[PDB]
Amino acid sequence: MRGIILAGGSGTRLYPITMGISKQLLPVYDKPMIYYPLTTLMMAGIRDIQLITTPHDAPGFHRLLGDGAHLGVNISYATQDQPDGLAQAFVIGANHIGADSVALVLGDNIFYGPGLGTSLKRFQSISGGAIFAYWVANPSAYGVVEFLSLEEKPKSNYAVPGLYFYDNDVIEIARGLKKSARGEYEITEVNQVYLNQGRLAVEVLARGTAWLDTGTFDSLLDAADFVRTLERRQGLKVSIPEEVAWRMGWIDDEQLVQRARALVKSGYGNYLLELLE
Amino acid sequence: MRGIILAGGSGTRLYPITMGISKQLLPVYDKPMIYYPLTTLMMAGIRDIQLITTPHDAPGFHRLLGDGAHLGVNISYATQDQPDGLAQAFVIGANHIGADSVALVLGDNIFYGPGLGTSLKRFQSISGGAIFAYWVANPSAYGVVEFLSLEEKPKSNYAVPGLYFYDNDVIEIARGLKKSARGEYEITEVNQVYLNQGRLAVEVLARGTAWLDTGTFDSLLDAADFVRTLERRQGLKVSIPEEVAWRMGWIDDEQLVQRARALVKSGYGNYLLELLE
Amino acid sequence: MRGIILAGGSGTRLYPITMGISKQLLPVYDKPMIYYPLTTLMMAGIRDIQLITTPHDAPGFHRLLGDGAHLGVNISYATQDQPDGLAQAFVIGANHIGADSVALVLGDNIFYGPGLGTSLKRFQSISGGAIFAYWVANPSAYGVVESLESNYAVPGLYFYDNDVIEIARGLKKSAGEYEITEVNQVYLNQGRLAVEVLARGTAWLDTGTFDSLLDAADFVRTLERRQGLKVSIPEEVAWRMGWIDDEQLVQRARALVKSGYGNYLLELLE
Amino acid sequence: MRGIILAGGSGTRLYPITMGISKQLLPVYDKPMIYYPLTTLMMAGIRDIQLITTPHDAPGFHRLLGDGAHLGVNISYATQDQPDGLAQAFVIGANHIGADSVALVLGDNIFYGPGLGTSLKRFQSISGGAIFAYWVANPSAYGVVESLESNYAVPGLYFYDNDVIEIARGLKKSAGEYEITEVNQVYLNQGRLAVEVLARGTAWLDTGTFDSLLDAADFVRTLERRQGLKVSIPEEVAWRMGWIDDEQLVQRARALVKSGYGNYLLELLE
Ligand SMILES: Cc1cn([C@H]2C[C@H](O)[C@@H](COP(=O)(O)OP(=O)(O)OP(=O)(O)O)O2)c(=O)[nH]c1=O
Ligand SMILES: Cc1cn([C@H]2C[C@H](O)[C@@H](COP(=O)(O)OP(=O)(O)OP(=O)(O)O)O2)c(=O)[nH]c1=O
Ligand SMILES: Cc1cn([C@H]2C[C@H](O)[C@@H](COP(=O)(O)OP(=O)(O)OP(=O)(O)O)O2)c(=O)[nH]c1=O
Ligand SMILES: Cc1cn([C@H]2C[C@H](O)[C@@H](COP(=O)(O)OP(=O)(O)OP(=O)(O)O)O2)c(=O)[nH]c1=O
Ligand SMILES: Cc1cn([C@H]2C[C@H](O)[C@@H](COP(=O)(O)OP(=O)(O)O)O2)c(=O)[nH]c1=O
Ligand SMILES: Cc1cn([C@H]2C[C@H](O)[C@@H](COP(=O)(O)OP(=O)(O)O)O2)c(=O)[nH]c1=O
Ligand SMILES: Cc1cn([C@H]2C[C@H](O)[C@@H](COP(=O)(O)OP(=O)(O)O)O2)c(=O)[nH]c1=O
Ligand SMILES: Cc1cn([C@H]2C[C@H](O)[C@@H](COP(=O)(O)OP(=O)(O)O)O2)c(=O)[nH]c1=O
Ligand SMILES: [Mg+2]
Ligand SMILES: [Mg+2]
Ligand SMILES: [Mg+2]
Ligand SMILES: [Mg+2]
Ligand SMILES: [Mg+2]
Ligand SMILES: [Mg+2]
Ligand SMILES: [Mg+2]
Ligand SMILES: [Mg+2]
């Protein structure tokens, strides 16, 4: 399976913050936003990950991640020239995907808890498509699964999170789409095709899971508050790519220490040292 | 008086966040970090403001602020090629300053409360230099005024915040400095010259003032939590440059509404509309 | 003017917390809830204060407050045997009030900001009734002033003339409590209900749900950590009002050293 | 095994809050403090539980808890007349314990995470003494296990054999309280003090200062808002343990509808 992170978009619901910075480069406590979906793909066992970015934000991502070799992954880059929709991921990413299955994760999504770590590797064998469900108070704000049926932006309270697994048929499914009334090629339309053909699996996320989207002022700040709370109260750092790479055997002890040393002043590197001790 | 915002630096204490984004473009709840020192200079009555940035982060600042005309100010840009210290502001900014006095504000500083709004215009008449003092629990982390005496990074608990006003002599004072042991031209050395010559005024900030530096994970997140608390509990938005420009008469009603309309999706523009209603 | 704090009720929206403790003895960061409305009256210049409690919660209040001498005030107590409504304040407190005007504050309300401190003394010479207004997103949840049933909710602070006792014994129950709404209207039907909007930047909080209680505690701690302010500290207000001296404040501080509250009193004597 | 909760003490580090209320009746978001240690014992399989309170705070506890029938347990009470130390638990509770092993939990402690739920039943067949370890940045502030006086602090959860009564009546005061430290050592001098480190990812909280209380409340609400978990809800544990039925849980829910706590119980019956 190949991985793609959608890390473009305009981020209008964060203006004026996102007039100066990609949403995916915003801090969520102790790390950039893009670390969270990155580590989700890593935990699923995916090493060849393509980032889709805007042309203007790309240099920041390169500065942060480079080719991913320090995290034991192969990060590549594609450019999305206009924010024309999520389903463009499969068109832009077609050459990256090749003949393989694909995992798409949205750049503003955080997945934490039971069933959202290394157990996600079970999806590499996907045939058809596989998406998820999570209860929310304001479903009209989300894509909604009825339990059967899907609808963008009301009749189930289950939002569909931004993590999707597909077989190789997704590329041609995406290529056939037209822009919606709001001028975007829509992931819900991709999901509908699978649903209509009896080839869409859905699972509700496990009890005790946190799913977050950081695209509003309050949701960004709630996310950062959560991550800190985990550290201060449970002693846990979450979505640390160096640690994930280390535990998967993609980087060794010496590489981990070289990372720690570079990150000593903020405190982040001290965590990496503790992993060894 | 002319204004300069120090908006470069490496931001090492925020790594790996600041490997991807300038510290000055980070969110503090509902706006970018750079809005806070920007509005401090605006409230002091300063319209000609030069931003000093790194070469690599400059495009983000341009995208966000442009030439400042939409906020009724003249924003200009200078490039600092290496993060060689705060006191370089006066060398880099010498042509901007010309014959005038100058206000320097640090890009990571937030000033809120009594005495930190439009009353700051009293400093435009500065002769000599003028700095401030604020009680902190861990003074060894800061520049410290003894009450008399100054020291970078212990014997008063009063930190010197990142807001400085100088007469035109500062340029030549700065040009004469050498790099410290840590490889930076030091603002505390500028302040020392004024102090030694009997030309440094110091005021403790007023009771009820908040001074924040956002350069660690915890201080960034504490700042954002504070700003939201002000809104949710007291109904106050703070450091909104459009509002400051409007109240000073640098933008009119029509310009304010044009700003509001551009910022409708995040909620920020709704505040600007309410100002009119 | 005399003062009354409604410190009874059931507190049902905080069950099961308030099956063990009065809402008005709950902590809001560094002090009990009752300290907030108490300091509001104190800052309005009021020194003779009656607290209305339930029978079963009264001993807690006595242990915390005693007769108030230590805060330079006269705290009296009255019992409300059933939680039959807010307007019963003026029946229960009728003798406490006597000939004077009265200030009523609700036990679960926090008032903070411009015009909610020592400026409140101006309401002492009130004739008729004065209440307040605070813009809210959901006026249907509150009492609403324009009329009385706008986005303007009526907070739990009220100033009245001596007439108020009469009106209150007058009232009957509701669809059931003796309602403060009905008092205010009866004043408005005489056209002597004055309203003021709370100033820009004020915080008005009600601590009667899990989230509102916790939001309030967070707010108070934020004020300390970020602006170095401790708020509604009655010892401090007493000492600023001239009601207790430098030395009385020192003795308060010694009793409170272990929590850190006492250290803040010591700093007042720089 | 039998259980004891130390729910007395003065709570000096929370003055003036705890001049009006016991520390153990303070709210931690959506429930009283006492619910947390109570549910810890309940999850250890313990159903006969004695709460030790001060004389003056006891009525609050009775109103909240009664005899525990409604939570499928047997809650008894004992009075501690002066706050003379934690080891007095085993003197006061000596008859409650009788022939059995005992679980002691501190009233102001919250235990949350892996190995602090129904796994705790394994300590019922304890021989000797078992205590726990939690890494802290400032071990000087705590009791410290390696020996006993490392960065490993001893939380307020303890499992002992029937011997514990003997040792406890044995002890004398300290420089002054009857100390739990001294009990544990006396077991260690026999080499039968077992220690386990709390698992990665556990939260151990003590709510005895302004900041720690408020940090704990924030933590509990964060778990609900972000992971949809309500924690240490005794009704839920009773119903999962088989100690009360679908219908008993419904009746609990009706008494608690206004606060929202009751709605969570209804959702358990999906
Ligand atoms: C629309 C679009 C979004 N994205 C990213 C941004 C988010 O991480 C994710 C989901 O989109 P959204 O969360 O909608 O992000 P957005 O950039 O569209 O923001 P807003 O709607 O507030 O204007 O996909 C792209 O990479 N390309 C795109 O064309
Ligand atoms: C050192 C330096 C800082 N700055 C800015 C960044 C901050 O807003 C402000 C004060 O500096 P600091 O707060 O020290 O910021 P920094 O970038 O040096 O971060 P760190 O010390 O953690 O590595 O000045 C410059 O513009 N140019 C510089 O050469
Ligand atoms: C109804 C009533 C309230 N009060 C107090 C409690 C509050 O501080 C204030 C306003 O009442 P409420 O905020 O409504 O408090 P409550 O005790 O009625 O709780 P709930 O409504 O959640 O069941 O007045 C009394 O003293 N006596 C009473 O009869
Ligand atoms: C000392 C003592 C404490 N306790 C309870 C209170 C706590 O839940 C627990 C541990 O005690 P502490 O946490 O020390 O609580 P405290 O009441 O002694 O408060 P402070 O030390 O701030 O004055 O034991 C008793 O029941 N009886 C006692 O004699
Ligand atoms: C292994 C690991 C997991 N996690 C996170 C991912 C998940 O949100 C959560 C649980 O991970 P894991 O224990 O792998 O869960 P599961 O086996 O149920 O998939 O912990 C990290 O943040 N860092 C790590 O190094
Ligand atoms: C006028 C104004 C002030 N402020 C802030 C700046 C200060 O932190 C605080 C007080 O401002 P101000 O009332 O101007 O204070 P002072 O006259 O004492 O200088 O409010 C804004 O955030 N936005 C505004 O539009
Ligand atoms: C004097 C004082 C005021 N305050 C609070 C009361 C108000 O909420 C806020 C402003 O008080 P104050 O300065 O007395 O305001 P005003 O003159 O506008 O009435 O500060 C305290 O909390 N403690 C104090 O000792
Ligand atoms: C079963 C249950 C557990 N918990 C808590 C107790 C623990 O802190 C955490 C884990 O409980 P549990 O799943 O019983 O863990 P273990 O088998 O590791 O002992 O969840 C509740 O809060 N409520 C409940 O109903
Ligand atoms: Mg979008
Ligand atoms: Mg999104
Ligand atoms: Mg620096
Ligand atoms: Mg700084
Ligand atoms: Mg009520
Ligand atoms: Mg109320
Ligand atoms: Mg103690
Ligand atoms: Mg304790």
Nearest alpha-carbon partner for A234 in D116, D157, D150? D116
Half-sphere exposure of A203 (CA within 13 A, CB side): 14
Q: Which structure tokens are listed for C122?
A: 């101006």
Residue A37 CA, closest ligand 1 atom number: 8
**A165 in Cβ contact with A130 (< 8 Å):** yes
Residues near D199 by Cβ (< 8 Å), separated by ≥ 6?
Answer: D113, D114, D115, D116
How far apart, in whole angstroms, are the C-alpha atoms of residue C163 and residue C169? Answer: 11
Burial group, residue C224, by CB count within 10 angstroms (0-12, 13-18, 19+)? middle
Question: Cβ of A67: how many Cβ atoms within 10 Å?
Answer: 12
Nearest-CB residue to A266 (from B15, B21, B27)? B15
Minimum CA–CA partner of C218 in chain B? B229
How far apart, in whole angstroms, are the C-alpha atoms of residue B43 and residue B241? Answer: 9
Residues near B67 by Cβ (< 8 Å), separated by ≥ 6?
Answer: B74, B75, B76
- The technique is X-ray
How far apart, in whole angstroms, are the C-alpha atoms of residue A58 and residue A208? Answer: 35
Alpha helices by DSSP H, B89-157:
89-92, 94-97
For residues B63-92, b (16+ Cβ closer than 10 Å) or e, as one string? ebbeebebbbbebeebebeebbbbbbbbbb
Question: How far is the alpha carbon of C41 from chain B, nearest alpha carbon, in Å?
Answer: 21
Backbone phi, psi, residue B196, to 5°: -60, -35
The bridge status of strand A143-146 relative to strand A200-204 is: unpaired
The answer to whether A270 faces chain B, any CB pair under 8 Å, is: no
Domain A1-277's class?
Answer: alpha beta
Kindly tell me whether chain B and chain D come into contact, counting contact as 3+ Cβ pairs under 8 Å: no
Burial group, residue A81, by CB count within 10 angstroms (0-12, 13-18, 19+)? exposed
Q: How far is the CA of B11 from the centre of ligand 11 (A)?
A: 7
Half-sphere exposure of D4 (CA within 13 A, CB side): 31
Pairs of CB atoms within 8 A across B/C? 37
How far apart, in whole angstroms, are the C-alpha atoms of residue C188 and residue C197? Answer: 17
Nearest-CB residue to B30 (from A217, A262, A268)? A217
The domain spans of chain C are 1-270
**A238 in Cβ contact with A227 (< 8 Å):** yes
In this complex, the chains that touch B, judged by 3 or more CB pairs closer than 8 A, are A, C
The answer to whether C15 faces chain B, any CB pair under 8 Å, is: no
What's the CA dihedral at C218, C224, C227, C231 to 10 degrees?
90
How far apart, in whole angstroms, are the C-alpha atoms of residue A187 and residue A200? Answer: 13
Residues near D152 by Cβ (< 8 Å), separated by ≥ 6?
Answer: D133, D134, D135, D136, D139, D144, D145, D146, D197
Residues near C175 by Cβ (< 8 Å), separated by ≥ 6?
Answer: none
Chain breaks in chain C (C to N over 2.5 A) after: 146, 149, 175
**B58 in Cβ contact with B79 (< 8 Å):** yes
DSSP string, A123-168: GGG-SSEEEEEEE-S-GGGSEEEE--EEEE-----EE--SEEEE-T
3-state percent helix, strand, coil for chain B, nearest multiple of 5: 40, 20, 40
Backbone phi, psi, residue D248, to 5°: -65, -40
Ligand 7 pocket test, pick from C31, C36, C41, C43 with the greatest ligand atom count within 8 Å of Cβ, gives C43
How far apart, in whole angstroms, are the C-alpha atoms of residue D112 and residue D203? Answer: 5
**Residue D198 gets which letter from DSSP?**
P
Burial group, residue D39, by CB count within 10 angstroms (0-12, 13-18, 19+)? buried
Check whether C143 is labelled as a binding-site residue: yes
Q: How far is the CA of A39 from the centre of ligand 5 (A)?
A: 10
Burial group, residue D257, by CB count within 10 angstroms (0-12, 13-18, 19+)? middle
Residue A113 CA, closest ligand 5 atom number: 8
Burial group, residue D172, by CB count within 10 angstroms (0-12, 13-18, 19+)? exposed
**Residue A176 gets which letter from DSSP?**
T
Q: Which residues line ligand 7 (CB under 6 A)?
A: C 43, 112-119, 231-232, 236-237, 240
Ligand 3 pocket test, pick from C36, C54, C108 with the greatest ligand atom count within 8 Å of Cβ, gives C108
Tokens 């002992």: give the residue.
D160
**D71 in Cβ contact with D243 (< 8 Å):** yes
Residue nearest to atom 1 of ligand 2 (CA): B85
Entry resolution (Å): 1.6
Phi-psi region of C144 (alpha: psi -120 to 50; beta: other; left: phi over 0): beta
Is any atom of ligand 8 closer than 6 Å to the C-beta of D231? yes
Chain breaks in chain B (C to N over 2.5 A) after: 147, 153
Is any atom of ligand 1 closer than 6 Å to the C-beta of A33? no
**Residue C138 gets which letter from DSSP?**
-
Backbone phi, psi, residue D50, to 5°: -105, 125
Is any atom of ligand 3 closer than 6 Å to the C-beta of C57? no
How far apart, in whole angstroms, are the C-alpha atoms of residue B141 and residue B43? Answer: 28
Which residues sit opposite A203 in a β-bridge? A132
Question: How far is the alpha carbon of A253 from chain B, nearest alpha carbon, in Å?
Answer: 20
Whole-number Cα distances in Å, B50 to B36, B92, B107, B241: 15, 10, 12, 16
Check whether A155 is labelled as a binding-site residue: no
Minimum CA–CA partner of C203 in chain B? B234
Question: Cβ of D122: how many Cβ atoms within 10 Å?
Answer: 13
Tokens 């020996």: give the residue.
D147
Which protein residues have a CB closer than 5 Å to ligand 12 (ion)? B 108, 213, 215
Half-sphere exposure of B160 (CA within 13 A, CB side): 24
Q: Which structure tokens are listed for D70?
A: 């409604």
Is any atom of ligand 6 closer than 6 Å to the C-beta of B44? no
Alpha helices by DSSP H, B157-216:
170-175, 187-196
**Residue A112 gets which letter from DSSP?**
E
Which residues sit opposite A42 in a β-bridge? none
Nearest alpha-carbon partner for D111 in D33, D204, D220? D204
Cα torsion angle, C242, C245, C250, C256, sign: negative
Pairs of CB atoms within 8 A across A/D? 37
How far apart, in whole angstroms, are the C-alpha atoms of residue C148 and residue C180? Answer: 11
Contacts of C16 in chain D (CB under 8 A): 31-32, 35, 64, 256, 259, 261
Contacts of D210 in chain C (CB under 8 A): 27, 29-30, 221, 259-261
The answer to whether C229 faces chain B, any CB pair under 8 Å, is: yes
The answer to whether B267 faces chain C, any CB pair under 8 Å, is: no
How far apart, in whole angstroms, are the C-alpha atoms of residue C142 and residue B197? Answer: 62
Backbone phi, psi, residue D98, to 5°: 65, -115
Longest dimension (CA), chain A: 55
How far apart, in whole angstroms, are the C-alpha atoms of residue C117 and residue A123? Answer: 62
Asked if the Cβ–Cβ distance from B226 to C228 is below 8 Å, we say no
Asked if the Cβ–Cβ distance from A207 to D228 is below 8 Å, we say yes
Longest dimension (CA), chain C: 55
Nearest alpha-carbon partner for D233 in D210, D260, D215, D207? D260
Residue A210 CA, closest ligand 5 atom number: 8
Residue B24 CA, closest ligand 2 atom number: 8
Tokens 């720089």: give the residue.
C270
Give domain C1-270's CATH architecture.
Alpha-Beta Complex (3.90)
Which residues sit opposite A132 in a β-bridge? A203
Residue nearest to atom 12 of ligand 5 (CA): A117
Nearest alpha-carbon partner for B225 in A233, A229, C29, D205? A229
Residue A52 CA, closest ligand 1 atom number: 26
Q: Which amino acid is at C74?
A: N
DSSP string, D95-161: HHHTTS-EEEEETTEEEESTTSSGGGGGGTT--SEEEEEEE-S-GGGS-BB--B---EE--SEEEE-
**C230 in Cβ contact with C267 (< 8 Å):** no
Q: Which structure tokens are listed for D185?
A: 């050592």
